[PDB]
Each structure stands twice: as structure tokens, then as C-alpha cells.
Amino acid sequence: GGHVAQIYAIRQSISKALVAYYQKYVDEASKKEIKDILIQYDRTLLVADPRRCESKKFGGPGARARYQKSYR
Amino acid sequence: TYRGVDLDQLLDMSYEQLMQLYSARQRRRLNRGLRRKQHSLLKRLRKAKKEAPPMEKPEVVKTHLRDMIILPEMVGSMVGVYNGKTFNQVEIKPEMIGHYLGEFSITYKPVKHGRPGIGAT
Amino acid sequence: RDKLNNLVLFDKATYDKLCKEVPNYKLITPAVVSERLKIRGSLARAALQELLSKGLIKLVSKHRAQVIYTRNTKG
Amino acid sequence: GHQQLYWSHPRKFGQGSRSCRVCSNRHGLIRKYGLNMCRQCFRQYAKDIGFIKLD
Amino acid sequence: MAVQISKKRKFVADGIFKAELNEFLTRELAEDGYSGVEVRVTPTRTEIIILATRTQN
Amino acid sequence: PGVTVKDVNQQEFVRALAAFLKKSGKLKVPEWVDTVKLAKHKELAPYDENWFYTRAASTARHLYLRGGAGVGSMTKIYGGRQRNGVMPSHFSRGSKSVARRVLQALEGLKMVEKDQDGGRKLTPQGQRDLDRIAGQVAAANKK
Amino acid sequence: DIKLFGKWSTDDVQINDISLQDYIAVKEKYAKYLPHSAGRYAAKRFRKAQCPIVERLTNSMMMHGRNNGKKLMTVRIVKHAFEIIHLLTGENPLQVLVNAIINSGPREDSTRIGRAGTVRRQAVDVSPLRRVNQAIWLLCTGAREAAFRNIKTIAECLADELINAAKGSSNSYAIKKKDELERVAKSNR
Amino acid sequence: AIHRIRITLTSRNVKSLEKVCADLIRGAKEKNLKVKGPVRMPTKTLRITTRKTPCGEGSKTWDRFQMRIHKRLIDLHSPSEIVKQITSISIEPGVEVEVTIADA
Amino acid sequence: MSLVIPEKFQHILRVLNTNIDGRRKIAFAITAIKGVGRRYAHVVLRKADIDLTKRAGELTEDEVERVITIMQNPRQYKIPDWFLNRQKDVKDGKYSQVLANGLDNKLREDLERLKKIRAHRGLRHFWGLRVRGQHTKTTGRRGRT
RNA sequence: ACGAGACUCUGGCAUGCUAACUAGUUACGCGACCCCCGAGCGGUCGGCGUCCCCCAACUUCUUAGAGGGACAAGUGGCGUUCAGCCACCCGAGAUUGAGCAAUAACAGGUCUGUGAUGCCCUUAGAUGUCCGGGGCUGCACGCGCGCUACACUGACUGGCUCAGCGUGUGCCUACCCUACGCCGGCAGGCGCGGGUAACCCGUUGAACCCCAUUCGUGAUGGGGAUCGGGGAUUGCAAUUAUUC
Ligand SMILES: [Mg+2]
Ligand SMILES: [Mg+2]
Ligand SMILES: [Mg+2]
């Protein structure tokens, strides 16, 4: 990944790591009381972003963009 | 004079240090093989020089190799160089030793102009 | 607005002007002082750091493109 | 003829040495993975080699 | 042993084998009803099986 | 507590340790330290005339992180973008002579040594001073 | 309570008109430390309304073609300029932002298909999404044309634009087109 | 013997690959050997893309041709003279097979 | 940085054969003369052992001619052989940097000597066409019309 | 019934399964480090080993097979209450992108892709074929597709930190990717290995970006056209400039 893509992966991982440790080695009534607060705020801390990228097609420079058509 | 050294030292000096007063391209070209085709042209040029009567311009020699560098050995020669249709006439004088025979025989007559026809809306 | 082109090591006549006026307002950036009296912008940051050495202007931002300064506390 | 200049020009490096392996053509070649086949013939034999239009 | 071919070219090399093999048997067994070929490859003793409609001729 | 180079801001750390070679002048500087043009993709040779010391500080820190690197690896690290002018810009590596000279420069100070594999890595004492400086800058940075 | 950038507590901002109480997204619920979150706020409709305002202006500022991947840069542009605001006025950057938005949000516009006289035929009131959508856009365009060839850069170039818009002085480029759009709609009522 | 022999295989189609390897794996179990399971490499995709038209006339359409190469290998600690027969009784004419000795 | 403008701050100079402006920085003021670029100005400045942060105007008399001796005889003043303009001159062969109207007439020497030899490059120079092998079908139109 | 859809590939989820010395992760035993007055299970290591058979296990990470999983399913609202649509909950995912693609048509392009071809032309002073040189670039002009810019949401110098596709030594065919050490300012050169490849290049130390300095609104430290000189590389040959 890149700088920010990494920067999101760290915070996403440590949030999952904490709750996973909380669920396993102590009462998860505490984990449920920590799972809620970081859900009502920035749901991305646990749910991973499912959109990666889109392939490029042979009609233009990018995925949806097309090479500029000239007919005059 | 050529590089602060006059033409007198140019004629008698050897190949292993004319590379340095040559530019990078001609130095590289002589650093590698000098084939049998251009040796014969120099051979035939020498025979033309000796066959020239005194104070007389040696006879025209024709060639296809419009890629030879000019050497001190054959300065003062009448060399005809093909451009694809005819042998252009070129005289050889001291100040080209770092050029080519093709650089002088131009391969196309320059365009003057023509009145636009059906195109050029 | 055509051209200013008039700034070479701001003189004593200007010198007294900014030294008694700049510390009396809050918005000090090398750009505004460049607009305010006439300053170009190179010696602007030289002037602000020279003032910053005196201890009468307080630096808040300290960034590359933006070095933001403010006047002292009053009272 | 004679043997001294018939092939004097080197069929070394370049388009002269390279050619298609089906039509002896020297245009639209594909040397990737050592095919040495032109693009028209490669499309023609693609299934036999095993290049499949998956997606 | 000394000079072995890269795997990507190797599967190409087998692929370019059957392509031309099928092509030549097509021009050779056209009137015989070629109807395709199968090359039963083994590391040493490769065998080729023709699928002619009239194998008798 | 500590202190390694990882827990100190590398931007301030590389400035601090470059001062160390400036203070303890033994790093042999080549003749051309004024005229290299420094990584061909670049022009307008570096502003700081001590650019060889900040380079030496920088390459020492880099090797401490990812050791077993040679001259070619150094040129890739410092390679920037070459602006081809009218042609679109590309990536080009740094000059090999400067990276070669600094690599031998640390040899004369016995911070780095050749290894069984290609490249050179910091010696026990070589990384020792690097951690001393890392502690020095941290304590200065901390207060 | 959220110490945005380590300061500027949320629970003091007030918004006047009932319409953008629903829309202004500076409330403590969506009180983020930074204006940066790839939260799919444009994948569906109606989500950009609840996207935080501080994210919106730093997301519109990232627009001239030459700066399209500069989000972290636009975060520093707002975070710096927010210092210039709080330095000059002493109150909340967040408050004056909202006052600038509601003041600079054009209400009446003109759109039709008949033979338009000057802009269009029929004057049409705006919805309170394009109103806040457009209002940010003048502010972003209001710093861009000023910071193009001036000595002063975007941090102050944005800064003076908001405070001029917030108080109302007819000298900000944003509110200068606002009333102009309003009066042309009143012209062709 | 006891020999640390490895057997590898590779092809383009996977359905035969799954069965033929497992055939060697099961042959190993009925031979009661210290057997290392099938270690499988990342697939290799060949990505030849072609103009799709014989002439120059078209609408700039292209042809994306693919070929997938999958390679797997098994490892054993059993004598060569007692493992040759099993690796020989499985043929699968669509597959490529290579052997190497314990010391490699 | 000073209380008043430096007393001998020269707003205009008369170095060589032009008037370089004094307000501009020294490294980019001396470069205004023909024959010196950004790198040549910077290296000769370092050999002069003068700081870069100052302007051209306050550069006092001693450094006025110290630079001039640097950049007319680079060879003996430890300027590298790779840096010169007229390296291996086509007539004299001395490694020298030409930096004046001399450069104006030296460059003028090439156009005639190629013209006097009727080289294809010289003829294209004479006719005003491109000399390095460019394409003139759809470019260079502004020079004729 | 064909086409659409369905279908195949691809992307996202499985701390579920099968496995990993050509991927590794933790734990350990070291070795250097550092604070040490002692701390100490302090932490740094892409430094070493942990399959020469335990000196430890395991698959979370990586890879790829089998699978499962999503279906307007649940909840409300609308709708003839139909087909469906809207919103919400739980969810990785509530529309991921492609490939294929009907009946046909067009004097569409292709005889310069083919030992695909009908007919015509030419066939020894060849329109066969080879060799040499030139040309396909040639410029009063017009059009199209693009790249670089018109800058201080910026150039310059220095430093910090990050990827994914995919390639790599040859039937012909000689032409591969390259680490490291040395010389050169660069261009490069010289030795020295590795790699037919999840082994080496390569932890692919990419750019933008990020953090400090200079510039100061000036056609300027923008912009890099044209233009002179010099040096290297490819080749048998570089001029009309191969490239750098
Ligand atoms: Mg593009
Ligand atoms: Mg379908
Ligand atoms: Mg030029």
C-alpha cells in the first residue's frame, strides 16, 4: 500500500487486536462496552474497506475515461 | 590550423593520438574496425593523388560510401559522392577532418514552395 | 496594480515604522507584512525571525509555507 | 550470386532476421514467450497453444 | 540438461508443437477425414493419436 | 531507557549525527565535494556545502535499518525523479561515485565493513556511536 | 469535548436558521478529530449532507486539476487557516465557518426552458442541499482566484474570504455572487 | 535407503492437478512414508494482448489472451528404489513431472 | 537586515559588457551574462569563497574582480575539465569557457565555417531550417508566418 | 425457443478446512546494541539458528484448492398490494469489473498477415530475388491525437517514508534480467557472482506525497523550444543529428 493506506491499516488493526484480546482474555461485557463506542464513531476501525480498484479498459487512459473522440 | 596544431603535423601523425583531436563520434568510429571498403577508397585516393600532374587537381573519384570521415591523408582531393541519383562533386580542403562525405552531398533539392491545391481547406 | 519592484533592505525610515506598528496588531504573516508596508517576502521572514529573536512577537504556527505570528499578551 | 555479396548484408539484429514462423511475415510480430509469430496467425492458432479468452 | 527452457516458454513450446502438428496433419489427412488429434505426451515416450474417420486408408 | 534510532525523529536525528562528523572531522572528503551535481536527475548542486556530511549521516542511518546494501542499492534510495523537460518525467538513480566515495569514507572510520555477501553492514562499534547520537538527540528533543 | 485539532470544543457552536440545523454537520455526533475519512459519503445519495463540514471544505479545496491527490495538503490548508481565524478573532473557527456558510448560501436561482431573458425565465428557490453545496463552492473558488497571483497564499486567502462572508461586507467574492444571483431571480420573478 | 526426495508437477488445468497430486499423496500413505503435503506455488498468468483485427480498420478493440500455469510439489523421506514405481504408475498425459534426489 | 540600505549597495553594475541588476541574488545575477548558467555561476562563486545568501549589490569591490579572474581562466583555478563551454575548440583546442560577446562571435564562427564548407548543417542554418533532424511538416511555422 | 439473463474469469469475506525450508508468524537460544547506579520479560535488529532433523509450535499474515457466504433475505413504507421500488437493521459484500453474445444487414476495412484465393498484369534489361546509396522525416499552409507548461494549491536543494501488475539467458537467433567490489562527475567502463525463477535481481528502498531551506509575484530560481561545443553507449554504417 501507500502512506495513508498504511495509516488506515494500523488504526484498523489495533482496534481489532484490542477487542480480540478483550474478547478472549477478559469479560467481553467489557468488550461489548468498547465495541459500541468505536462503532458509533468511525465504523471503519473494524469493518475493512471492500473497494480495492478497477481495471483499465483498452478504449481510454483509465477505467471509465475514454480517449477523446474527434470526428470533425 | 586544426586544434591549435597546424595541418603540417596532421598529415604525418599516427592514428593512436588523432582520436583525441577527433570528437567522441569519430574517435569511437576509428577505435573500432576500419573495414576493407574504406581502405580501398583511401588506396584509390592515394593513387589519384600520385597520378595528379604537378600543380594539377587530381581527377574526380566516385564513391557510394557517404559515411566516411575525412582524414588528413586525403585532403585536397576531388571526390564524387552518390546521393542516390548522381555523384555530387565535392572538393576536399583542410577544414573538414571531423565531418563526413555525406554531410556535403545533399540528398534532396530544397523546396521552394507550391500553391495549395485541393487540400488545405 | 502594475509592479512594485521597490524593496532593498528596508531603510531606517521604514525601520522605525514596523518596529512600533507590527507588534500592535494580531495578524502577522510574511505575506501580509509584504503587502502592508511594501516588503518583497524574502527579507520578510528574515525580519520576523529578527523580531522573533527580540522576544516581542509570539510564534504559533512554525510551518514551511505558513509561519504565523501574533502580538504579545496585553495587560 | 556470387557467394561474396549474395548475403553480404548481415541478417543479424533487427527486422530482417526476425520473421513469423507461419507466414514468413515481418510485421505485427510477437516475440513474447518466444512465439515468433505474427499477431494475425497467433489469433488463428491461439486455442491450440492454450491462450484462452477468460476475461 | 545444460540448456533447459523456461517453463512459460515450455508450455508455449508444447502448445506451439500441437498447433503446427495439427496444421500439417490437416493438410495431409484432409481427404481422410482428419477430425482432430491428441498428443499423449510423456517425459520420454510421447505418443500421438490421430482421430481419422477412415483410418484404414 | 532506550535509546535506538527508531524512537527518534529521523529528520532531526540525521541532522544531529551529521553535526557529529562535522565536529569530529575524520571522514575523508574527495576533491570534488564542490562539483558533483549530485544525482544526475538533479541540477543546481546542493545548497549546503556540507552536503557530504549530511549524506554520510543519511547513508549511515539507512544502512543501520536495512543492512547488507551496496553502491547500487544506495543510488536507488537517493534516486529521485528526472524531469525530462518536454518529455514526461521519469525515475533516475543517484550518482554512483558519491555513494561509492561515502561508502569508503565510513570504511576509513571503521563504522562499516565488507561481509560474506554482497554489500557492507555496520560493525558493532559502528552502530554503537549511532545509538549514542540517537540518545543525544532524543534527550535534546525530549527537553 | 472532542478537542478538534486539540482545541475548538464542539459544544458551543450555534446555527440560526432551522433549515441547516438538519444539514450542518459540526455536531458532536460527527465530531471528528480531522477532516479526512474515506467513508463512502458519495457512493449513495443524501450521505454528503451528514458528511462533516470540515471534511467538505477540505475536500472541495482539493480541486484545480493540478492538485487532485493533495488531501493531506488540503488538511494543512484548513488547519493552518483555522489558526489564522482563531488568531484574528479569538472565537471558534467552527462557529464562523457555519455563519459564513449560512450567510453565503444563495436561496433564489433561475432555471427554465423557455426563452431565457438574462439568466433563465422562472426564479426557483434552492433546496437546502445545493444551497450548502454551492455555498462551499464559492468559498473554495473565492480563495483560489485570490491566491493565484497574489503574494498572500491560500491560508490567509481562504481566511479573509470566510470572515468577510461571515460578517457580511459585500467585499467577499462569495457573497458578491450570492446577492447577485438572488436579485436576478427577483428580477425575473 | 532413506532419501529426502521431492516430486513436483505443473500444468494449465487444475481439475486434473488436484486429483493427480492427491493420487501421489494417497499412494504415499498406503506406503507408510514420512510425507510432506502438497506445497503449491502462486499461479503464473501469461497476458498476451493482441490487436484483435487482421487489418488496421476497427474501433480500437483489443484481445486479452490468458494462460494460467499452476505448479505444485510433494516431498518424501523414502527410498528412491521404492518410490519410483508409484510415481510411474500415475501418468496423466496432461501433466509435467520432475524428480530430484535427496541432496538435490 | 541592516538599519539602512548599505552605503555602497550598487543597484546596477557594469561587469564585462552588460548591466546585471543588483537586487537579484549573486548566484543568479552573474549568470545574467552570456556563457554562464546556474551551475557555472554556483561553482565559480564557491571558488571565490563568498557566501551564497547575499545579494549582488552589497558585493564590495574586492569580490567584483575576484570572480572575473575565476571565470576567464578556469583551468588554473581548479574548475573541472567537464565544465567548460568551448572544450576542445575546433580551431585552437584549449579547454576554455567563453562568456562574452566573444561567445556571440564564437557561435557566429560556427555558422560561417559550416557555411564556408557547404555542410548540410550550415546550409540548413543559412536557410533558417532546423539543423538537428527535426520534423518541419507541422512545426516552426511561427518563424515564417 | 434464440438473444438478455443464466454462464466463465475476476474483486471483496471468512483468526472456518486442507498445507507449506522456493511464504512465513510467534515463541525460544544466541549475537551484537543501547539506559544501567541494576534495574531487565526494557526494548532495536530484514543480524544468526531453531529440518543435517528437533533445536518449537502454528497458518493469523503470503500463496491456492475444496468449500461456504447474498437471495430484495429480515423490518417498515409505497405499489392493483401484483411484478416490483424506496428507507432502515444485521451484514465483508444490499448494483465489482469484464468475456461471451441473437435475426440479420453494410458493395464497411483487409488480396500490404498467410504455401487463403478467382481473374488480370509481369516473368530474364523481371513488377522474382539480392547488393549499394537515397526516401518513407523532406516545409509559405490547414486539421487531428497527444506531452510539457503558462507557476509561490509553486519551483529549488536536503531529508523521511510507502506499491502492484509483470519480465528475465534464445529451434531459427547472435539479442536476457542483473546483485556486489573497483575506476569515471555523469554518461558509462572493468572484474565478480546469482537467476530458466514465491529461490537472484527483489523487503522490488518508484513517483506523487510528506518534513526543513532558498526564492518573492519579476517571463522570475516558471517554461524548456531553438541553438554551440564537448563526452559515452548500440551497430558494419549514427550526417538529414539513434540514444544518453
Ligand atoms: Mg494517461
Ligand atoms: Mg449473459
Ligand atoms: Mg542546443
Swiss-Prot record, chain B:
Keyword entries, A-Z: Acetylation, Cytoplasm, Isopeptide bond, Ribonucleoprotein, Ribosomal protein, Ubl conjugation
Keyword Ubl conjugation: yes
A GO-annotated cellular component: cytosolic ribosome
Record location of the Glycyl lysine isopeptide (Lys-Gly) (interchain with G-Cter in SUMO2) cross-link: K93
Domain of life: Eukaryota
Transmembrane segments: none
Chief place where the protein resides: cytoplasm
MF (Gene Ontology): DNA binding; MDM2/MDM4 family protein binding; RNA binding; structural constituent of ribosome; ubiquitin ligase inhibitor activity
Subcellular location: Cytoplasm
One record GO biological process: ribosomal small subunit biogenesis
Record family assignment: Belongs to the universal ribosomal protein uS19 family.
Subunit structure comment from the entry: Component of the small ribosomal subunit.
Function of the protein: Component of the small ribosomal subunit. The ribosome is a large ribonucleoprotein complex responsible for the synthesis of proteins in the cell.
Protein name: Small ribosomal subunit protein uS19
Organism: Homo sapiens
UniProtKB/Swiss-Prot annotation, chain D:
Annotated positions of the N6-acetyllysine modification: K47
Positions bound to Zn(2+): C20, C23, C38, C41
Modified residues (Phosphoserine): S8
Co-factor: note: Binds 1 zinc ion per subunit.
UniProt-listed GO biological process terms: cytoplasmic translation; translation
UniProt keyword annotations, A-Z: Acetylation, Cytoplasm, Diamond-Blackfan anemia, Disease variant, Endoplasmic reticulum, Metal-binding, Methylation, Phosphoprotein, Ribonucleoprotein, Ribosomal protein, Zinc
Modified residues (Omega-N-methylarginine): R11
Keyword Cell membrane: no
Needed co-factor(s): Zn(2+)
Localization per record: Cytoplasm, Cytosol; Cytoplasm; Rough endoplasmic reticulum
Gene Ontology CC: one annotated term: cytosol
An MF annotation (GO) of this entry: structural constituent of ribosome
Associated disease: Diamond-Blackfan anemia 13: A form of Diamond-Blackfan anemia, a congenital non-regenerative hypoplastic anemia that usually presents early in infancy. Diamond-Blackfan anemia is characterized by a moderate to severe macrocytic anemia, erythroblastopenia, and an increased risk of malignancy. 30 to 40% of Diamond-Blackfan anemia patients present with short stature and congenital anomalies, the most frequent being craniofacial (Pierre-Robin syndrome and cleft palate), thumb and urogenital anomalies.
PANTHER family: 40S RIBOSOMAL PROTEIN S29 (PTHR12010), SMALL RIBOSOMAL SUBUNIT PROTEIN US14 (PTHR12010:SF26)
Biological role stated in the UniProt entry: Component of the small ribosomal subunit. The ribosome is a large ribonucleoprotein complex responsible for the synthesis of proteins in the cell.
Family per record: Belongs to the universal ribosomal protein uS14 family.
Subunit structure: Component of the 40S small ribosomal subunit.
Name under which the protein is recorded: Small ribosomal subunit protein uS14
Swiss-Prot record, chain E:
Function as written in the Swiss-Prot or TrEMBL entry: Component of the small ribosomal subunit. The ribosome is a large ribonucleoprotein complex responsible for the synthesis of proteins in the cell. Has endonuclease activity and plays a role in repair of damaged DNA. Cleaves phosphodiester bonds of DNAs containing altered bases with broad specificity and cleaves supercoiled DNA more efficiently than relaxed DNA. Displays high binding affinity for 7,8-dihydro-8-oxoguanine (8-oxoG), a common DNA lesion caused by reactive oxygen species (ROS). Has also been shown to bind with similar affinity to intact and damaged DNA.
Coiled coil location: none
Subunit structure: Component of the 40S small ribosomal subunit. Identified in a IGF2BP1-dependent mRNP granule complex containing untranslated mRNAs. Interacts with HNRPD. Interacts with PRMT1; the interaction methylates RPS3. Interacts with SUMO1; the interaction sumoylates RPS3. Interacts with UBC9. Interacts with CDK1; the interaction phosphorylates RPS3. Interacts with PRKCD; the interaction phosphorylates RPS3. Interacts with PKB/AKT; the interaction phosphorylates RPS3.
Residues that bear N-acetylalanine: A2
Impact upon substituting S6A: No effect on phosphorylation by CDK1. Greatly reduced phosphorylation by PRKCD. Abolishes phosphorylation by PRKCD
Organism in which the protein naturally occurs: Homo sapiens (Human)
Protein name as catalogued: Small ribosomal subunit protein uS3
Parent-protein start and end of this portion: 1 to 57 of 243
Source superkingdom: Eukaryota
Signal peptide: none
Phosphoserine: modified positions: S6, S35
Curated annotation (Swiss-Prot), chain G:
Subunit structure: Component of the small ribosomal subunit. Part of the small subunit (SSU) processome, composed of more than 70 proteins and the RNA chaperone small nucleolar RNA (snoRNA) U3.
Keywords attached to this entry: Acetylation, Cytoplasm, Isopeptide bond, Nucleus, Phosphoprotein, Ribonucleoprotein, Ribosomal protein, Ubl conjugation
Modified residues (Phosphoserine): S127
Family: Belongs to the universal ribosomal protein uS7 family.
Any one GO molecular function term: structural constituent of ribosome
Cell compartment(s), UniProt: Cytoplasm; Nucleus, Nucleolus
GO cellular component term of the entry, any: cytosol
Subcellular location, principal: cytoplasm
Protein's recorded name: Small ribosomal subunit protein uS7
PROSITE patterns with a match to the protein in the record: RIBOSOMAL_S7 (PS00052)
Keyword Ribonucleoprotein on entry: yes
Organism in which the protein naturally occurs: Homo sapiens (Human)
UniProt modified residues of type N6-acetyllysine: K32
InterPro entries for the chain: Ribosomal_uS7, Ribosomal_uS7_CS, Ribosomal_uS7_dom, Ribosomal_uS7_dom_sf, Ribosomal_uS7_euk/arc
Function: Component of the small ribosomal subunit. The ribosome is a large ribonucleoprotein complex responsible for the synthesis of proteins in the cell. Part of the small subunit (SSU) processome, first precursor of the small eukaryotic ribosomal subunit. During the assembly of the SSU processome in the nucleolus, many ribosome biogenesis factors, an RNA chaperone and ribosomal proteins associate with the nascent pre-rRNA and work in concert to generate RNA folding, modifications, rearrangements and cleavage as well as targeted degradation of pre-ribosomal RNA by the RNA exosome.
Gene3D superfamilies per the UniProt record, alphabetical: Ribosomal protein S7 domain
One Pfam family, short name: Ribosomal_S7
